[PDB]
Symmetry: C3
Subunit: 258 residues, 3 copies
Amino acid sequence: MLEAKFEEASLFKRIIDGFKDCVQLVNFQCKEDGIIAQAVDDSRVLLVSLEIGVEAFQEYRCDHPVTLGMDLTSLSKILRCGNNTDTLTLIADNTPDSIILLFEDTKKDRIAEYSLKLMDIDADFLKIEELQYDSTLSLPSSEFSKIVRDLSQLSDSINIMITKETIKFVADGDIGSGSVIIKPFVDMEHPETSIKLEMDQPVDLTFGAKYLLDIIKGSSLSDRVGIRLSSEAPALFQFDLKSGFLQFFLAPKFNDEE
Amino acid sequence: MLEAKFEEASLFKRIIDGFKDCVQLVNFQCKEDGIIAQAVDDSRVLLVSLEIGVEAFQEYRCDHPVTLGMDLTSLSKILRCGNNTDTLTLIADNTPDSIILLFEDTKKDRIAEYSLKLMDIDADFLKIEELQYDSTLSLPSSEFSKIVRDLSQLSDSINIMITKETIKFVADGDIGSGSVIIKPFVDMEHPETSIKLEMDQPVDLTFGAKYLLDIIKGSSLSDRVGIRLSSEAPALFQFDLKSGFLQFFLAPKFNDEE
Amino acid sequence: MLEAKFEEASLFKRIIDGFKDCVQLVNFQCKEDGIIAQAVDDSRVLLVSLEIGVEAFQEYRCDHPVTLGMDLTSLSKILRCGNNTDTLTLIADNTPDSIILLFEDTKKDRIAEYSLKLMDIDADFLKIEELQYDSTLSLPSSEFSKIVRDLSQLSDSINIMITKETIKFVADGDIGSGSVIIKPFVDMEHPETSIKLEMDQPVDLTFGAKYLLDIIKGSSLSDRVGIRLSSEAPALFQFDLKSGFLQFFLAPKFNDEE
Ligand SMILES: [Hg+2]
Ligand SMILES: [Hg+2]
Ligand SMILES: [Hg+2]
Ligand SMILES: [Hg+2]
Ligand SMILES: [Hg+2]
Ligand SMILES: [Hg+2]
C-alpha cells in the first residue's frame, strides 16, 4: 500500500512544480526503499525522473509496492492546499482506482482530503542514465536559470559548449547573438556558489530553449544543479533533494530536435 | 443631501471591492442613520447588501435621504485614487444626476474630485434576511477563502454540510473529489481564530463555486466571517465593519442553481 | 568608436524602459561629449530624446562619433541581463553592422555578451526644443504618475490648464468627469516634494492619455519631473539624470491629435 507522510506539504508541491507544464502524465511507484516517478513529454525529448528515499518522509510504510498513473494537471490543481506548512500524507491501497492526498494542520482543526482519479499507464520505466558522461558540471541553479532566461530571448536553440576549463552557452537568432561564458572556481567564502567542471572530452550540444526553460524550475528544490553531457545520450540536469533527486534528461537537437 | 466623509478612502475602496465583478448596478441610499446599498446579479442568485452607520464616518450630515443608482464598474474605475490614506467625501444634492467623490490629502495640496454619472434604478430594496437560520457559524475569513479556493478547482458546486459539532465542505467533479472538515474550537491564545457553530438543525446545501469565490473578497473587511444557513432561504455570509456590515445572500442550488 | 561603460547596468535598463513600448526604432549617436538618442513614434506625436554626458559613465572613450539605429524591442529583450548590479559596456566600431552589449560581474566569473543587429535609419535628429515656454512646472514624478493614472480611466484625453498659482488636470468622458488640482508649495522638510510653477502666460492644452501613460515611466529615473508647456509647440516632460536627461516632447491634440 502507499503511505507516505511529508513533514511539509511544500516539498511535494515544489517537486510536482517540476513536472508541471512540461509533461501531462506521471507514473509513480512506491516501494520498500521509497518513491520513484517518471514522466515523458509527447515528443519524447524530455524525461522527468524522481526519487525520494524513505528518509525524506516523516513516516513511510510499504509492505507492498503500488504503481499509479495520473494526470499531472489534476495533481497540481490539488497541490495548492498544502499551506506549505501543512502536513501531507499520500495514501493508496494495493489495487487503487484513486490516490488520496491528506493535508492536516498540527491541531485537529482543519483536514483537507482529496481523492484523485488515477489513469492506467503501461508500466515501462526507462533507465537511460549513463555510466560516464563526456563532461560534468555543477553551478548555482539560480545562475543556470539566469543563463537560460538570458539566451532564451534570442533563439529557440541554446548551445552548450565545453572545453578545458570553459563552459559556454550560446544563442543566435533573428535579432542577433548572445553568449554567457563561465569559468570553474572554488569559493571558500561559501562553496555553494562555486562552479565545478570535470571534462573528459570537449562537448558541444544544442538544446531547444523551450525545454531548458521547463528544466530551470528545479532551482526551487536545490541550490545547485548538476549538468551531465554526452554526445552519445540525452543530457542529464539534476536537482538533489535530502534523500533523493529530481532529474531531467533532455535529448540534444539533431539539428532540429529539442 | 449626501455628505459622507470617510477618514480613509481605503475603507470605501474595500467595500466596493466586495460588490466588484459579481454585480453591475448598485443602489445606494443615504439617510439619517447611515448609508445602505444593495446590488443583485443578473441571474438573481446573489444579493450584496451594505450598511454603514453614522459612526463609521469622520463627518456625516443628512437632513434629507437621497437614493442613487450607479454602475459598479464606473465606480471602481474611479475608486483607485484614494491613496488609501486620502480622505474621501461622497457628496450629492437631493435630486442628483451625479455623485461627487472628493479625495483630499491632509494638506491643501492635491485634490482629486470626480463627478460620476448616475443610473435610474427602480427603488426596490429587498428584506430577505431571516429571523432564525438552521445553523450559524463563524470562522476566520482567510480560512474560509482557502476552503473555497481549495474546492473550487474540483467542481462548479461546493456543498456545505452541518451536523452536531461538524462542518464539512465538499466538491466532487471530473478529476476527483475533495473535502475540508473543520470542528468548533475556542482559542484563548487569540479568539479571532476560533470556529463557532450553533446548530438547531443539520443542514446540507450546495452553492455554485463561482459565487462563493465572489463572496470571499469580504476577508479584506473583517477577520471573521459569519455564515448562516437555512433550507428555507438564501444563505447569508456576513463581514462586519466598525458600525456596519457587508452581507452576501446566496441562493442554494436547487440541483442546478448557483 | 563606441566604448561606454555604465557602473550599473540598471541605469541603462531604466533609460531604455522609457523608450519602451511607445517607440519602435531608436537612433543613437555617441560622440566626444557623450551619447544622445532620439526616437519618434509612427504617428509622429511623440519624440523621446536622451542625453548622457561623459560623467555618467565609469569609462567612456570616443575618438570618432558613431551613429547607430536599432529596434527598441530587440534591445529591451536583451536588456534584462544586467542583474542591475552588473557592469554594462556598450561597444561598436566606426562602421558597425552590430552593437555589442557586454555585461560582467565584478569577478571574472560570468560574462554575458550580446551582438545586436543594427537597422539603417536616415540620420535626422530633430531640435524642436523652445527657448521659452508659456509655463513651466515641476513636481514629484510619482505624483504626476498618479495624476495621469487617475484621469486616464475617464477619457482618452487629459487636459492640463495653468493659471496663476494653479495647475489643473482634467478628464471627461462617458462615465463622468474628474479633475486633480494642485498648488505650488515649498516643503523645507524635504524640497523634493515641492511643486514649483512659473507662469508667463496661462496655458490650456489637451493630450492623448495613452501618450501621457507612456511618459510617466520616467519616474523610475528621477524623483521630479519638469513639464514645459506652450501653445506654439509640443510639450516637454523632462526627467533629469546625473549628467543627462530623458525628454518626452508630446504634440497637443488639435482637437483630435494625441
Ligand atoms: Hg508502497
Ligand atoms: Hg516543468
Ligand atoms: Hg442623506
Ligand atoms: Hg464580488
Ligand atoms: Hg563615439
Ligand atoms: Hg515609453
